[PDB]
């Protein structure tokens, strides 16, 4: 039979419909009154979190992040430039908003490592994502067989290196075949043409 | 007034001083920032890829 979770999931398929529609209109008011990075006791999308690797365990933290919407907040050239590069308004960053969030959340927690993340909506100018972060030093995590991999030294500052969930997707690493020529094994190693 | 020799006389102000961090005489005592190691500005040491040739 359907898991209770299956219902949360189901409501977040159409966030502008039914009850969740009214919850958002509610929360988003308290959300806009909160800081950029706010730690929360429980994920607003439980199926989503658990699906991403979340557990109700010591050493596991979740947080909401607000980032501005739109393109790049870019300054106009102060020196010579050819028309092609005189651009400002239509320049958009190459790192999606979800990925900025994950980072701002990570910095707020210097000892923690990003496990994954998910969007929790947006209004006219914010974009919210909740980020799951793990304490790689807390035993209970060091002793958990499904998370202890994040404890490894080789994982220090995952987000900042794009080893995150959205990190790899944004890096054009989804497909294993056609289209990932200049993507795999790394953008930089591919002359940065993807 | 000449910008040359005569304007050189009024130079008795102290700016750059021995740096607590790096030991170079570049700690601007008015800005309290070192122009050599960046002490007073950056926790990390001031350093740039243009202090040497591109491929070196």
């Amino acid at each position: 039979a359907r898991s209770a979770y299956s219902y949360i999931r189901e409501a977040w398929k159409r966030p502008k419909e039914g009850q969740i529609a009214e919850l958002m209109w509610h929360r988003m008011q308290e959300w806009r009154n909160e800081p950029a990075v706010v730690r929360i006791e429980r994920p607003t999308r439980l199926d989503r979190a658990r699906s991403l690797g979340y557990k109700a365990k010591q050493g596991i933290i979740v947080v909401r992040v607000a980032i501005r919407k739109g393109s790049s907040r870019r300054t106009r050239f102060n020196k010579g430039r050819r028309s092609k590069r005189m651009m400002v308004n239509r320049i958009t960053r190459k790192k999606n908003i979800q990925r900025i969030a994950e980072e701002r959340a990570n910095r707020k927690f210097p000892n923690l490592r990003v496990l994954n993340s998910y969007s929790v909506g947006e209004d006219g100018r914010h974009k919210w994502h909740e980020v799951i972060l793990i304490d790689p030093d807390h035993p209970a995590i060091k002793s958990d067989d499904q998370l202890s991999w994040i404890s490894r030294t080789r994982h220090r500052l995952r987000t900042f290196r794009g080893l995150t969930s959205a990190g790899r997707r944004c890096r054009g690493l989804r497909g294993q075949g056609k289209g990932s020529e200049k993507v795999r094994p790394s953008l930089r190693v591919n002359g940065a043409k993807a | 007034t000449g910008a040359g020799t005569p304007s050189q006389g009024k130079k008795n102000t102290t700016t750059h001083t021995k740096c607590r961090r790096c030991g170079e005489k570049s700690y601007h005592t008015k800005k309290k920032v070192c122009s050599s190691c960046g002490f007073g500005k950056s926790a990390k040491r001031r350093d740039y890829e243009w202090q040497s040739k591109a491929g070196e």
């Binding site: 039979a1 359907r2 209770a4 219902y7 949360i8 009850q19 919850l23 607003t44 999308r45 439980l46 | -």
Partner: protein, 119 residues
């Protein structure tokens, strides 16, 4: 609050929580929103309990309508830890389901009526 469409008077709730404690000793009860959901789906649920201080509300939003299309009765509890305690848990509990009462099939049945009347 968004899933709550009627208010359960303090007293009613007490009889409800009482009925719940004898159930766990005399009959059967399911503790936890997932197990409870499976009771309503499976039909093995007689009376389901839903806390009103659940955040995020998503965790329970479905109980109400689900219950109604499954004919299963449900009653609101204010505190999440009380329903936990009443269920016999040392932690709180968002929802609980009395899967076949015990030495309370009467009191219970009547609570289900009282609420049906509470509209």
């Amino acid at each position: 609050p968004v899933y709550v469409d009627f208010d359960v008077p303090a007293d009613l709730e007490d009889d409800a929580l009482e009925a719940l404690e004898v159930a766990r000793d005399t009959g059967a009860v399911k503790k936890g929103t997932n197990e409870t959901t499976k009771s309503i789906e499976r039909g093995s649920a007689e009376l389901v309990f839903v806390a009103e201080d659940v955040q995020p509300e998503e965790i329970v939003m479905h109980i109400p309508e689900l219950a109604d299309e499954k004919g299963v009765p449900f009653i609101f509890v204010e505190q999440q830890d009380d329903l936990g305690h009443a269920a016999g848990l040392e932690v709180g509990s968002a929802a609980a389901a009395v899967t076949d009462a015990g030495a309370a099939a009467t009191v219970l049945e009547e609570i289900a009526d009282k609420v049906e009347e509470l509209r």
